[PDB]
């Protein structure tokens, strides 16, 4: 199970689209 | 006085299947 979640886990004004990535990670991981 | 980012991140999550 540790192996599984390791495989899952792989100026800020410019980097708010990265936060979409974060929501998508929470979107993708928990789905 | 960002559609392609969505699709590509879906692609990378599917690479980690």
Curated annotation (Swiss-Prot), chain B:
Per UniProt, subcellular location reads as:
Cytoplasm, Cytoskeleton, Flagellum axoneme
Q: How does it assemble?
A: Consists of at least 3 heavy chains (alpha, beta and gamma), 2 intermediate chains and 8 light chains.
Q: What is the documented function of this protein?
A: May play a role in regulating dynein heavy chain (DHC) activity. May function in holding IC78 to the DHC, or in stabilizing the entire dynein complex.
Q: What family is reported?
A: Belongs to the dynein intermediate chain family.
Q: What is this protein called?
A: Dynein, 70 kDa intermediate chain, flagellar outer arm
């Amino acid at each position: 199970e540790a192996n599984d979640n390791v495989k899952f886990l792989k100026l800020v004004d410019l980097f708010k689209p990265i936060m979409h990535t974060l929501m998508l990670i929470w979107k993708h991981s928990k789905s | 006085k960002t559609e392609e980012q969505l699709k590509a991140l879906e692609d990378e999550f599917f690479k980690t299947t």
